């Protein structure tokens, strides 16, 4: 055939070891660029003026970090939400000082991860599968958008984006608690129920299916040799599993339908994580966790502290110390 | 009003405490609000000249109505709790306020997001149903079984 | 999509037990250490550099400033048996706030 | 950076000792009939 048709058949071929696809044509270059820039920055970038106060923070290994302290540092507060590609800088030296690598990385990554999600729909169509694995992936993806893009938009600066590093992530978390009382926000609470519950049901399901594996192997072999890839027959007895768990709790608290069970395993973490993504994306516009500071008052009007007041004291310590040379006026309004 | 020369007042970092330059030179407010220098509003524009905030105008022309507006807006910043306690998260109970801007932005981000999800759900479903595999894989015509191995 | 996949269903389900069970067990070991204040509190090399070099800053040194704030500001009300009185002048604070 | 002098040997043995254990076991599995 003609060259375009051949190219299209190759792009969309079900036979490539890794699927390419049309989402793939955007994903591949954008993830490669974000990856390469990230690796080089993390090793060798000089210090970055994150808070725009000429106080540059060292993120890279060669400039005194280790794996736990290192990071690619967010772009300068002087930039705010302005687009700062390489060609906006007078030189690579300036670009590095002002945190240009962060913006190149996060924009190429969010674009590429968005195409990763589309590529999941795309391959499922080519294989004749149902289409919703990409919906499950929208949960972690949404979370990535929240901390790298939506929170910056709300607060007016990429300098408030999550840093690309271990200790930077903890820094973002502690300041967020100071400024939003995230722990007292029900969507974060839904998030914790989602991940603690996803872990719990993960261990539960693994353990119940493992409990009920059909004997197919001798004592001197891993039971895993009892299952052969592609075999038609189920490898465990779900009725034995349900018999066990139904007695553990009570019968109607247990699933005997594998489809219903598996849908629940999908839904519970995906939904909780959609809520926690939305916690970050709505605290981005400063609708914050519950504030019960001084809610309990005695007959005279003395304040009777609750555990909410003690949280408040901790939050205050975070507040007054964070970005210790960056505030000149008495309220931290963003 | 207390006597400060706001143009020449160097803050702790070396940047101007009240006034500084944007990355393209324009005169802008200092402190963390450097990020917000693209802001434009009718209470502030009279102070702005071709080079940004105009120091002569700042020193001589700020009207009481501009002071009032600025104090009002500073004290109704769009920050508050889910139970409508106005202010920063460490604020005490007293002021029942959450900005309409926050309620409207948050609600609509939530709705836009779940609508994106609905778009993917229904678009993926429509594609599958048009092609005939929305209820699952035909056990006797499983397409992957007719494909060559990846390796 | 991802480059690798499960091919053995028994391994899959075992791994689902292994991952979150092992993680919780690791977290318990850390808290046994904390019983004794045997913390991963610091990186000594970071502290030596930062003490000698007042232009050296990392996210690690930043977080320690937050911790110092939490301890000073919370301890008096959180630990009432200590009868702490911390005059306003000794409290750690950055500029303005 | 004034790092601990045993950090290098500790990291190196931590990787190499169990890794070589696995390699030993893998190769002699492949060489079986």
């Amino acid at each position: 055939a003609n060259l375009w048709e051949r190219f299209c058949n190759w792009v969309t071929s079900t036979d490539n070891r890794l699927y390419v696809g049309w989402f793939g044509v955007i994903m591949i270059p954008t993830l490669l660029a974000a990856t390469i820039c990230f690796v080089i920055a993390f090793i060798a970038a000089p210090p970055v003026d994150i808070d725009g106060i000429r106080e540059p923070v060292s993120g890279s290994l060669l400039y005194g970090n280790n794996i736990i302290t290192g990071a690619v540092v967010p772009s300068s507060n002087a930039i705010g939400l302005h687009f700062y590609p390489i060609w906006e800088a007078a030189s690579l030296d300036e670009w590095l000082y002002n945190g240009g690598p962060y913006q190149l990385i996060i924009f190429h990554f969010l674009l590429g991860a968005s195409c990763y999600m589309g590529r999941q729909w795309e391959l499922s169509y080519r294989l004749g599968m149902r289409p919703w694995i990409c919906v499950a992936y929208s949960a972690p993806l949404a979370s990535a958008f929240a901390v790298f893009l939506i929170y910056p938009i709300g607060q007016g600066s990429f300098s408030d984006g999550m840093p690309l590093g271990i200790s930077g992530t903890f820094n973002f978390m502690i300041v967020f608690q100071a400024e939003h009382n995230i722990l007292m926000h029900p969507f974060h609470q839904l998030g914790v129920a989602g991940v603690f519950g996803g872990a719990l049901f993960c261990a539960m399901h693994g353990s119940l299916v493992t409990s009920s594996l059909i004997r197919e192997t001798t004592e001197t072999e891993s039971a895993n040799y009892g299952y052969k890839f592609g075999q038609e027959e189920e490898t465990y007895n779900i009725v034995a599993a349900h018999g066990y768990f139904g007695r553990l709790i009570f019968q109607y608290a247990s699933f005997n339908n594998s489809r219903s069970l598996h849908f629940f395993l999908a839904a519970w973490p995906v939904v909780g994580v959609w809520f926690t993504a939305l916690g970050i994306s709505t605290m981005a516009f400063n609708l914050n966790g519950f504030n019960f500071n001084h809610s309990v008052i005695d007959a005279k009007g003395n304040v009777i502290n609750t555990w909410a007041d003690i949280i408040n004291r901790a939050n205050l310590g975070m507040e007054v110390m964070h970005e210790r040379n960056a505030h000149n006026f008495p309220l931290d309004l963003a | 009003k207390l006597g400060a020369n706001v143009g020449s007042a160097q803050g702790p970092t070396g940047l101007g405490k009240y006034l500084m330059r944007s990355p393209t030179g324009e005169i802008i407010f200092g402190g963390e609000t450097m990020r917000f220098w693209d802001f434009r509003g009718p209470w502030l524009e009279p102070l702005r000249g071709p080079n940004g905030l105009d120091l002569n105008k700042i020193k001589n022309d700020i009207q009481p109505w501009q002071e009032r507006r600025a104090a009002e807006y500073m004290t109704h910043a769009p920050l508050g709790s889910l139970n409508s306690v106005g202010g920063v998260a460490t604020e005490i109970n007293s002021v029942n306020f959450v900005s309409p801007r926050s309620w409207l932005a948050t609600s609509h981000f939530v709705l836009a997001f779940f609508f994106l999800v609905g778009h993917l759900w229904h678009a993926g479903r429509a594609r599958a149903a048009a092609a005939g595999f929305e209820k699952g894989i035909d056990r006797e015509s499983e397409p992957v079984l007719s494909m060559p191995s990846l390796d | 999509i991802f480059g690798i996949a499960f091919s053995n269903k028994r391994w899959l389900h075992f791994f689902m037990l292994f991952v979150p069970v092992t993680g919780l067990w690791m977290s318990a070991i850390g808290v046994v250490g904390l019983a004794l204040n045997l913390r991963s509190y610091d990186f000594i090399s970071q502290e030596i550099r930062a003490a000698e070099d007042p232009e050296f800053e990392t996210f690690y040194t930043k977080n320690l400033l937050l911790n110092e704030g939490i301890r000073a500001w919370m301890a008096p009300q959180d630990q009432p048996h200590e009868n702490f009185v911390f005059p306003e002048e000794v409290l750690p604070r950055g500029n303005a706030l | 950076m004034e790092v601990n002098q045993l950090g290098l040997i500790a990291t190196a043995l931590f990787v190499l000792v169990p890794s070589v254990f696995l390699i030993i076991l893998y190769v002699q599995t492949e060489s079986q009939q």
């Binding site: 070891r17 090793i43 290994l61 060669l62 280790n66 794996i67 890839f229 592609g230 | 079984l145 191995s149 990846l150 390796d151 | 480059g3 690798i4 996949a5 091919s7 | 950076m1 790092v3 950090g7 290098l8 990291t11 190196a12 990787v15």
Partner: peptide, 30 residues
């Protein structure tokens, strides 16, 4: 020494990814 060590471990992990993907044990349906 420390930087070389952290980069070396990382590089080994990236190499492991390449072998685990392209030199995997092929899934066999039979």
């Amino acid at each position: 020494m420390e930087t070389i060590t952290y980069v070396f471990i990382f590089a080994c992990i990236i190499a492991l990814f390449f072998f685990a993907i392209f030199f995997r044990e092929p899934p066999r349906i039979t």
